[PDB]
Amino acid sequence: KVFGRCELAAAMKRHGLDNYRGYSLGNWVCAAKFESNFNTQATNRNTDGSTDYGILQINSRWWCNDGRTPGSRNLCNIPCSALLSSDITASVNCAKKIVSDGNGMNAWVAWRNRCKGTDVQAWIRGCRL
Template sequence: MLKLQLLVLVPVFWAVAQGSVFERCQWARLLKSRGMDQYQKISLADWVCLTRWESSFNTRAVNHNRDNSTDYGIFQINSKWWCRDSGPSRANGCNINCSALLADDPTVAINCAKTVARQQGAKAWVAWKVHCQGKDVSQYIAGCGLDLSDSASNFL
């Protein structure tokens, strides 16, 4: 059993160490290992859908907004509310510097996304509302060797 777990986890850790753009199934397995399946009643498939449309699974994605705020990382977390950068900020809900969201290791980004989800749910992400909400998102984790019964979609 330990060998099987290592075979599943080694590619995930290798992806974290080697680059900033995840392959869909590697990302899904990593999110599952970090407790994101059904986190705040948001399915794993919804998390993968959300990050696909927000950043194309790129931990270094950066997008500048019209209000002079910036969205950072794989979850595109906004500087106005959730992290601190040199731009306008009303809050630092995750108590981090925005640059921490750009690390190849997505631990800080995942923890901050959990904070956002606890306070606002998946509706905090525009891409989720447009591309994932109310849709069959099972294809985002299909073929990844994950138990689909643990990741039923669209709880919001």
């Protein structure tokens, strides 16, 4: 599924991401836009053996298990396929862990390069949450 900006904002709010660990909702919607173009099925297979999965492009080396990645930690304790659902719950649950395990949103390169220091409130402007 390909979400709309406000559609996604609302879904993320319902799932507790607004102000989660000091990151306002705009940050999360901005990250999703530049990581996956709001596409829940986005997959990026990297030359290093790992794959990035879903709307938040969560990596299979540290966070989910795809059975094909060397050094897998599976710190979200989920199969990576769960991250490809149209229901964002697994991706949000895992994202909460990622930001939690001492990284901040710098875990997402698209956030660091395209959202950080910008006016992220713009990503939720006009939206009914």
